[PDB]
Amino acid sequence: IQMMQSTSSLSASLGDRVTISCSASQGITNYLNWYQQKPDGTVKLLIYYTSSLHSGVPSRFSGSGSGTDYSLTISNLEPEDIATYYCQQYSNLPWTFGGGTKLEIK
Amino acid sequence: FNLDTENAMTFQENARGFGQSVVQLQGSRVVVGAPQEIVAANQRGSLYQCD
Amino acid sequence: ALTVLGDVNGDKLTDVAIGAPGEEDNRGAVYLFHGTSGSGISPSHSQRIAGSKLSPRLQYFGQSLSGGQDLTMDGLVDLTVGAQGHVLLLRSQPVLRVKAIMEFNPREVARNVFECNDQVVKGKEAGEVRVCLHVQKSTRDRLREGQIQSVVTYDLALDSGRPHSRAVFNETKNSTRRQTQVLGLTQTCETLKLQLPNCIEDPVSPIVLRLNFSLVGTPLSAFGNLRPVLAEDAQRLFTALFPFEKNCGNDN
Amino acid sequence: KNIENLHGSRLNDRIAGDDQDNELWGHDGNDTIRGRGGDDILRGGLGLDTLYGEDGNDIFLQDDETVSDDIDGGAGLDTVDYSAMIHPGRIVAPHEYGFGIEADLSREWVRKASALGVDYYDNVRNVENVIGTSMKDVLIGDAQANTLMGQGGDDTVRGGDGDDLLFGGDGNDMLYGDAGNDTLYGGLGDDTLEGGAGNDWFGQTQAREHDVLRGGDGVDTVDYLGILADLGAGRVDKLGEAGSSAYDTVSGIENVVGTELADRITGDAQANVLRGAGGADVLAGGEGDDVLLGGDGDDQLSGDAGRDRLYGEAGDDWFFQDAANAGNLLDGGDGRDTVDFSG
Amino acid sequence: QLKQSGPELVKPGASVRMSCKGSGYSFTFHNIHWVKQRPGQGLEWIGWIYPGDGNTKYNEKFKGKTTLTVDKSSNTAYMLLSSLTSEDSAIYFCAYGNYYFDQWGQGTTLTVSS
Ligand SMILES: *[C@@H]1O[C@H](CO)[C@@H](O)[C@H](O)[C@H]1NC(C)=O
Ligand SMILES: *[C@@H]1O[C@H](CO)[C@@H](O)[C@H](O)[C@H]1NC(C)=O
Ligand SMILES: *[C@@H]1O[C@H](CO)[C@@H](O)[C@H](O)[C@H]1NC(C)=O
Ligand SMILES: [Ca+2]
Ligand SMILES: [Ca+2]
Ligand SMILES: [Ca+2]
Ligand SMILES: [Ca+2]
Ligand SMILES: [Ca+2]
Ligand SMILES: [Ca+2]
Ligand SMILES: [Ca+2]
Ligand SMILES: [Ca+2]
Ligand SMILES: [Ca+2]
Ligand SMILES: [Ca+2]
Ligand SMILES: [Ca+2]
Ligand SMILES: [Ca+2]
Ligand SMILES: [Ca+2]
Ligand SMILES: [Ca+2]
Ligand SMILES: [Ca+2]
Ligand SMILES: [Ca+2]
Ligand SMILES: [Ca+2]
Ligand SMILES: [Ca+2]
Ligand SMILES: [Ca+2]
Ligand SMILES: [Ca+2]
Ligand SMILES: [Ca+2]
Ligand SMILES: [Ca+2]
Ligand SMILES: [Ca+2]
Ligand SMILES: [Ca+2]
């Protein structure tokens, strides 16, 4: 399942609301994940479902969607939110990642 | 006592003999014959399928 | 011309329609006869549709007939009538019945209510009557639940058939009451107080309550403005009794 | 005297039974049959028949015809069987909509046959169970407890109120439990099951098929190399391997019962009771208060977060626990159970 | 937490084995996945191995050049790369999880040149 992330780059100021959208070639029935890759090189898991929040992440992050369109939303940006974000699915083998969207502070 | 008379739909056709023979068909249409209508030369009679 | 219409009124007995194209100076009419238990046809008709009551252009209305199917997709049989230059589609309608029940509380008038007394306020007697109405459908069809609504008005008459009623309603202060309301296919209930202005010197006759109604069916917008109708044999009058307390001996 | 069964004539008959079990057949004609006491099998046959079962648990067998029948089962748990409508021979009654039979025990009728413009009904009263046909059907319950079986075809079943027992059978079926404490069996084929309000129960068979499971309000249960179940990710793999084509979609289910083989069960963020039964099972509870039961064999338990209570039962059980967690209970049961604080 | 081997330098045509070490909880309760990251590109999934039984599942386009092995005793996972080419220079990640990858390693750099 080819998975699309059209918006390659994004910019926002401290306190703004940011939306990252990822789309799929077919139905994924809510089987999608979101990951974060900081500039230092580490990779982290943010939400392990369409909306289920992980243990170690703050309440700022949130996700929603259904069918072929999904989105990750940042309610109130912070100076530690500079990283690349990927969308991954586990509905059909092989498991595929998204292209990636990069966030840089205005 | 429960037959509707104020909301009756009427089919009208100018063919001669229209309404002489009537029959319901397949729960959605009604067939009407026009025995005396002249379709063409040496032809008489026609059928209609009204929905 | 005559054909079979199937069961139209919902009594599980087959009904027929017979045509009279030559009536009213060749304008025509259609008669409807109900089927009866015993493999027979009722001797009198139940409906007469006249071409003059439909459109002035109709001639020979009823010269051809065909029935036994549903063409409106609402699960009710339909009748096709052929006339000179026109073909008409008459449609059956839902059939409705109403059942009514009346209860009193208390079931009987207490002794102290109507006994003669001088140190009491006259006309301050009490009571209660509970009235419940239920509208039900007889024919089986494919329309969804909750679409059928009707407006029902009715009369309540205390001591009907008596020049002067012993008991009066509290809100109107006379023996009659009119009320109209909209009903679905679900029972609804209403209660209202009963008051007595004077002592009853002939307690041997119970107070009698009478109810009779008229029903009008609202059209169905989804099925071409069809309106349900009341059954032609439906009971339209109901009665309950309100007896007095007995004191046959030593207040036993 | 001392006769239990009776077969009627080709004409109109009035057949009455006794307090024993009777099998009463009316054959052709219009017949009135009373079963009286006991459990009876009533088959009116062709014609307009009136059938009574009185007390006991009665069974009514219907035939391939358009003529209506009146059925009153009386007291007891009663059923009606419509299996003889579709048969390998030639069928006289029409099914031009392709819907087999349609049942509504709330409105007390069964649409036994249906042409495009004509609908044929049966009048059914005080009957709690229905059995469908080989084609697709629509089954609807009432406020009582009903047992609904769809048999073959792509059926739809609605249980209504009460505690029902719904069967899907072969084919792709739609089962709705509605209000009450229901029990849902899907059978062969790709089905979807939702129980709605109340505490429901689902039974699966570890075959090569895909099913969708929805547990609404209340605590709900699913029962089954073994299985790989991850309620957090909403996916269960039936044959134990992730990403397989034999998998289930799970949402709103709190309790899981494993297979006698070796299973892997993981719980979501809610309160979970996980049962592993026989075999070597791996159990993880996630976060929140959970109850773990490993059953027989050597099992491994996690209880990641929250105030959990862990039972190991028989076998050489292994426990993982965090030293900074509080409010936990452990019970190794029979065997050389080991606790590990290095997690 | 997963510990990976250090950076590696290799000549084309050779083979390199990479290590990924964890704990008993991770290898008992979770599968182990391997993910690559080419420079100036995204992330691609290779496959997983189940430490309890050693069963494997592979991405179709990586089937030929990849072999997954596990040492259950010491809780170490190994990936064997064969016929190294200039397209195989990337950073390789190991992560554990069933359907979502929970904990990621710090990464290992592979340099294919001469
Ligand atoms: C058929 O009808 C037409 C109508 O005008 C008539 O002219 C013709 O003669 C008829 N044919 C025969 C064979 O009578
Ligand atoms: C009840 O009957 C009286 C005559 O007996 C009639 O005038 C009245 O209209 C009836 N009630 C209704 C609601 O029609
Ligand atoms: C009884 O009172 C009501 C309401 O005041 C009125 O509509 C009705 O006409 C009265 N009946 C008589 C008989 O006066
Ligand atoms: Ca009739
Ligand atoms: Ca109709
Ligand atoms: Ca015997
Ligand atoms: Ca018989
Ligand atoms: Ca018996
Ligand atoms: Ca019979
Ligand atoms: Ca029969
Ligand atoms: Ca019986
Ligand atoms: Ca019974
Ligand atoms: Ca019963
Ligand atoms: Ca079926
Ligand atoms: Ca029920
Ligand atoms: Ca089925
Ligand atoms: Ca139920
Ligand atoms: Ca339920
Ligand atoms: Ca099925
Ligand atoms: Ca199934
Ligand atoms: Ca639930
Ligand atoms: Ca839990
Ligand atoms: Ca097990
Ligand atoms: Ca076990
Ligand atoms: Ca827990
Ligand atoms: Ca055990
Ligand atoms: Ca033990």
Residue numbers in the entry:
A (entry chain L): 2 to 107
B (entry chain A): 1 to 51
C (entry chain A): 507 to 758
D (entry chain C): 1131 to 1354, 1370 to 1488
E (entry chain H): 3 to 52, 52A, 53 to 82, 82A, 82B, 82C, 83 to 99, 101 to 113
Question: What do the study's own words say?
Answer:
The Bordetella adenylate cyclase toxin (ACT) uses the αMβ2 integrin as a receptor, but the structural basis for integrin binding and neutralization by antibodies is poorly understood. ACT uses the αMβ2 integrin as a receptor, with binding required for efficient intoxication of macrophage J774A.1 cells as well as Chinese hamster ovary (CHO) cells recombinantly expressing integrin. For many integrins, the inactive conformation is the “bent” state, where the integrin headpiece points toward the membrane at an approximately 20° angle relative to the membrane-anchored “tailpiece”.
Here, we determine a 2.7Å resolution cryoelectron microscopy (cryo-EM) structure of the ACT receptor-binding domain in complex with the αMβ2 ectodomain. The cryo-EM structure revealed that ACT forms an extensive interface with αMβ2 that primarily involves the RTX domain linker regions between blocks I and II (L1) and between blocks II and III (L2). Instead, RTX751 inserts into the space between the bent αM headpiece and tailpiece, and contacts the αM β-propeller, thigh, and calf-2 domains. ACT can only contact both the αM headpiece (containing the β-propeller and thigh domains) and the αM calf-2 simultaneously if the integrin is bent. The ternary complex map also contained a well-resolved N-linked glycan at Asn1059 in αM calf-2, with the core fucose residue of the glycan packing onto RTX751 Leu1124 and Phe1125. Comparison of unbound αMβ2 with RTX751-bound αMβ2 showed that the binding of the RTX domain stabilizes a conformation of αMβ2 that is partially extended relative to the unbound αMβ2. Notably, ACT binding to αMβ2 positions Lys860 and Lys983 at the plane of the host-cell membrane, with both side chains pointing toward the membrane. By contrast, M1F5 is non-neutralizing as its epitope is not part of the αMβ2-binding interface.
